[PDB]
Structure 1
Amino acid sequence: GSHMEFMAEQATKSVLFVCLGNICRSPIAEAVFRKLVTDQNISENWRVDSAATSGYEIGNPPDYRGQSCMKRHGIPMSHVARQITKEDFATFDYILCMDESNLRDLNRKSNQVKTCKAKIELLGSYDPQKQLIIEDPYYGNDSDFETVYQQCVRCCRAFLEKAH
């Protein structure tokens, strides 16, 4: 219908979720955030993605263990692992990472580019329960993936509502 039917559209917001590999934590946060925005009729106002600080996993689907967790929670992930680019720093409002090694790495990168538009933060800096670090489940088990998933639901929810 009309462009004046509802309140006037917001400029698109963008968020990129990042870990070292882009197979475990970051695709899970991406698919969690994408569900939220899709369920709330606002996916057309978001550019949502995920990427890796390194090229070790380029082209690979998500970790099968994380995929099984997400499938339990009804959010199957459809993602091809990719490495962060220079353009990403210029194009995203937010780059949200999982841990401290991630943040040091991205901070190194941010200083090699001409325009860094993005606010670079830890995702868990949004957790109302104050669990700052979202711990790597790569060497863990099914309850470690569940933990990450639950942290991602709390943090993506608070981020959506109220960005830093």
Structure 2
Amino acid sequence: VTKSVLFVCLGNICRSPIAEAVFRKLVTDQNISDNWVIDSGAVSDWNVGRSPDPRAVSCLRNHGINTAHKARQVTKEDFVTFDYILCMDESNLRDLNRKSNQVKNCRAKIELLGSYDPQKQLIIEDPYYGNDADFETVYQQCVRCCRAFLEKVR
């Protein structure tokens, strides 16, 4: 009825900022944004306090989306308070699993965002060392996975 979802990547400056804003848009368009608490976080602390990478911001803005996220790191509390933690790749999945083992009575389902892709691209690859086209690929996978995810989580 209210559900919570945390999107997670490694730095929380390129992928999960995009996933969060795409999902937030989707749920606003669908007029159910009240039924959702949405956030994104990082496996590491390298970029804590910083706003999304410039390339992430340009990608979003050219699809009409904006974000006010500043990077934060995932914590122990996040495994108890969020219903879904959706991450980008298998090392993120690994680290979050190791980390959830430290909590006991973890509430969150941890899954690859790519699990919901109709086109089956399971991994959303880190675009940090790439170029604008790669940020666009990440954007496109996030739209596909977030639409199919919202339909399944009832």
TM range (shorter): over 0.9
**How do 1:2-151 residues align onto structure 2 when only pairs under 5 Å count?**
11-151=1-141
Q: Tell me by how many angstroms 1:114 deviates.
A: 2.8
Q: CA deviation at 1:71?
A: 0.5
TM (norm. structure 2) is 0.98
Q: Separation in 1 of the partners of 2:10 and 2:59?
A: 20
| Greater mean alpha carbon deviation, residues 112-121 or residues 122-131 | 112-121
In structure 2, the gaps of 5 or more residues are none
Deviations 1:56-89 (A, max 9, x none): 1000000001100100000011101000111110
The TM-score with structure 1 as length reference comes to 0.92
- 5+ residue gaps, structure 1, are 1-10
Identity of aligned residues (%): 81
Alpha-carbon distance in structure 2 between the residues aligned to 1:141 and 1:35: 24
> CA shift at 1:163, angstroms?
3.2
Q: 2-side partners of 1:111 and 1:163: how far apart?
A: 25
Q: How far does the alpha carbon of each residue in 1:21-64 deviate from its partner, in whole angstroms, 9 at most, with x for none? A: 11000010000000001111111000000000111100000000
Q: Which has the larger radius of gyration?
A: 1
Matched pairs, number: 154
